[PDB]
Amino acid sequence: VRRLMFSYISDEQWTPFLYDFYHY
């Protein structure tokens, strides 16, 4: 199943792991 993430963003570090959509 996918991790649905938009309003409450429960994630650790900022780093761009894979080149999908959010990659800064």
Add this chain to the structure above:
Amino acid sequence: QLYENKPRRPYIL
């Protein structure tokens, strides 16, 4: 200027 430039990891919306 007024631009929301913050560092974001790959989180699937």
